[PDB]
């Protein structure tokens, strides 16, 4: 049972500092090179930086030399990452990782660099359409929030076969918009019940909408 | 200082069919050691990245036997014997050999599947919406294969462009379809005067164009 836990990402201001850290259980913390690795929304692997089992060597890539610094605390089992002179192109999920054959890897921390406030999403409700193909759509749509992520649940998780939630996409106006469907039987809407589950954690807004066919 | 290139680009396969990409390098990765540092990975949609094999070869543990690493010197493979619709995500190679420490651009695998054409459903703005002053138009292309589709946008029959934006699903779990929403931005003021809303999609499942529309009132 290896496990890699990340900490610290969240939105920043360019020019802001931001401290990455990465706990670990299920093998010797002291033995091991660690790195980070970071992935630019939509983008491939990249590597960052690299610090000995004893934090005698230390390397770093080309963009963050000026900037990154690599640290970590055999004593507590820690790792961590210092950044200082944060750019939009460090923007990404940044991944803790095992330095050798990178084998093991953290579920990533996501931070994001910009200028632009965070903002709460609006959700719309999709309202199902009148005719039968004996299949119904409907959703939610969630408009204008900043930064990523967002969540969307139907019916607090009990509803899970038919729903398509979309990946976010960015508008000319700088903030983010998403919907989130399900398909239904027709005939079900009078006897069933749609609510969307909406959580944005970063504005610490929480919204459920219902979702019903036009008056 | 030292650069990876990987072939192809996409991928798709039909289960049960082999596989097989190369990455290759800028300069010999051979070393002093007697072992080349080369490693290839996975990263599942959604997912976080893992090891599938490891110093070109070796398969790390929790790894099927479907899965072989390849080669030497300049040029370096990874194949899979028969595919799985486990398989479906983007393959990258790395080496641990010098600083800095590389990756690929990676290759993306995707399941080939039999031809299904979309259903197809149009949302008008919510009342809500138009009370905020803003007006969208969704529509949704429901479990279709293969990806490749124009959705073209209609108000009274006018062709509209650079107004609407696409996202899509990944390839379902159980289906191997796609899905996919056309979201088309306008005015509450210009919504309120145009009377129908239309939605055109072409896809090579369908035998001609189809079209999914309203009028503003019912
Ligand atoms: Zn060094
Ligand atoms: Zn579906
Ligand atoms: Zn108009």
């Known amino acids: 049972e290896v496990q890699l836990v990340e900490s610290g990402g969240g939105l920043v201001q360019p020019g802001g500092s931001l401290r990455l850290s990465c706990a670990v259980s299920?093998?010797?913390?002291?033995?091991?090179?660690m790195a980070w690795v970071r992935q630019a929304p939509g983008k491939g692997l990249e590597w960052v930086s690299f610090?000995?089992?004893?934090?005698?060597?230390?390397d770093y890539a080309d963009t963050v030399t000026g900037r990154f610094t690599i640290s970590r605390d055999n004593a507590k089992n820690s790792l961590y990452l210092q950044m200082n002179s944060l750019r939009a192109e460090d923007t990404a999920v940044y991944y803790c990782?095992?330095?050798?054959?990178?084998?093991?890897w953290g579920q990533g921390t996501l931070v994001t660099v910009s200028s632009a406030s965070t903002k709460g999403p609006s959700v719309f409700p999709l309202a199902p359409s009148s005719k039968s193909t004996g299949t119904a759509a409907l959703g939610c749509l969630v408009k204008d929030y900043f930064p990523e992520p967002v969540t969307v649940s139907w019916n607090s998780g009990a509803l899970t076969s038919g729903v398509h939630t979309f990946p976010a996409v960015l508008q000319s106006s700088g903030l983010y918009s998403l919907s989130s469907v399900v398909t239904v039987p027709s005939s079900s809407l009078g006897t069933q019940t749609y609510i969307c589950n909406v959580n944005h954690k970063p504005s610490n807004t929480k919204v459920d909408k219902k979702v019903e066919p036009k008056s | 200082d030292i650069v990876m290139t990987q072939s192809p680009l996409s991928l798709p396969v039909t289960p049960g069919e082999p596989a097989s990409i190369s990455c290759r390098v800028s300069?010999?990765?051979?070393?002093?050691?007697?072992?080349?540092?080369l490693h290839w990975y996975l990263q599942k949609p959604g997912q976080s990245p893992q090891l599938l094999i490891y110093?070109?070869?070796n398969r790390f543990s929790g790894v099927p036997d479907r899965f072989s690493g390849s080669g030497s010197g300049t040029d370096f493979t990874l194949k899979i014997s028969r595919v799985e619709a486990e398989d479906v995500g983007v393959y990258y190679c790395?080496?641990?050999?010098?600083?800095?420490?590389?990756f690929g651009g990676g290759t993306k695998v995707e399941i080939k599947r039999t031809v299904a054409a979309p259903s197809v459903f149009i949302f008008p703005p919510s009342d809500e919406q138009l009370k905020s002053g803003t007006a969208s138009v969704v529509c949704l292309l429901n479990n279709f294969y293969p990806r490749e589709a124009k959705v073209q946008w209609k108000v009274d029959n006018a062709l509209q462009s650079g107004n609407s934006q696409e996202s899509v699903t990944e390839q379902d779990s159980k289906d191997s379809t796609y899905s996919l929403s056309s979201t088309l931005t306008l005015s509450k003021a210009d919504y309120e005067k145009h009377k129908v809303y239309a939605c055109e999609v072409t896809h090579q499942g369908l035998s001609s164009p189809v079209t999914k529309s309203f009028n503003r009132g019912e």
């Open positions: 990782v095992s330095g050798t054959w990178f084998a093991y």
């Open positions: 299920g093998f010797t913390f002291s033995d091991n090179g």
């Open positions: 610090i000995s089992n004893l934090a005698y060597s230390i």
């Open positions: 300069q010999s990765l051979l070393h002093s050691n007697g072992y080349t540092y």
């Open positions: 110093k070109v070869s």
């Open positions: 790395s080496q641990t050999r010098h600083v800095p420490y590389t």
